[PDB]
């Protein structure tokens, strides 16, 4: 999504919970989420070495794309990520080109 574009990409799951995306419009699919689909913070998220991705019973786990780090509480460095994800919807940092 980007306010305008209607994205064209689809989720989609097979039966045993596994998703893939597929393209609309290019008839593409891919087993990645796509960075069109990925909110500015997850983005920023998907930037930072910290991700968090859920298990098939709903339980996030986070990992490190550095150091290949992998545990179930928050690291400080991402709750510092969270705390700004709340800045964006309140800020327009799209306009921050504009006075």
């Known amino acids: 999504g ?8 689809t ?16 008839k593409q699919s891919t087993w990645e989420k796509p960075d069109d689909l990925k909110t500015p913070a997850e983005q920023l998220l998907s930037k930072c070495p910290w991700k968090e991705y859920k298990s098939d019973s709903g339980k996030p786990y986070y990992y490190n794309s550095q150091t ?9 460095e991402l709750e510092d990520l969270e ?7 309140a800020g ?3 306009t921050k080109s504009n006075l």
């Open 2 to 9: 980007a306010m305008g574009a209607k994205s064209m990409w």
């Open 11 to 26: 989720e989609h799951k097979s039966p045993d919970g596994r998703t893939y995306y597929y393209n609309t419009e290019t």
């Open 68 to 76: 290949k780090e992998s545990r179930w509480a928050k690291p400080k």
């Open 83 to 89: 705390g700004y994800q709340n800045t964006i919807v």
């Open 92 to 94: 327009s940092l799209i």
